[PDB]
């Protein structure tokens, strides 16, 4: 019955996953560094970036949004709003 906040979490995660997808493709990453990526060490270094950037992307966004959702009490405002339209429809 509390269903709107979980949506907010689903739409945020959904926007982030799509925001980063072109960086999860090793091909487009190599296209930006074609000559550098044709060296062994270059390939090793690029691999360390995309895997760490993605982790950094995920972690930074996870920790701020959880903080933003706290500083604005959105989970509660929305839970109050979900259970309040139900009392009105009843």
């Amino acid at each position: 019955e509390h269903i709107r906040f979980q949506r907010l979490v689903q739409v945020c995660n959904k926007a982030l996953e799509e925001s980063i997808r072109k960086l999860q493709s090793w091909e487009k990453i190599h296209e930006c560094f074609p000559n550098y990526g044709q060296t062994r060490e270059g390939i090793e270094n690029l691999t360390v970036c995309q895997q760490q950037v993605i982790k950094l992307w995920s972690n930074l966004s996870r920790v701020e949004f959880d903080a933003i959702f706290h500083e604005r009490s959105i989970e509660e405002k929305l839970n109050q709003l979900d259970d309040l339209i139900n009392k009105a429809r009843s």
């Binding site: 269903i3 949506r7 689903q10 739409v11 959904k14 926007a15």
Partner: protein, 32 residues
């Protein structure tokens, strides 16, 4: 303004009926 106009790109939700389930329109179709 806030109904269809994205402040900095203006992406009209012109995808006709969208797809309503669970009392809301589903993300999957909305984001493509």
């Amino acid at each position: 303004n806030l109904g269809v106009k994205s402040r900095k790109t203006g992406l009209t939700v012109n995808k006709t009926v969208q797809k309503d389930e669970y009392s809301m329109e589903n993300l999957n179709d909305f984001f493509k």
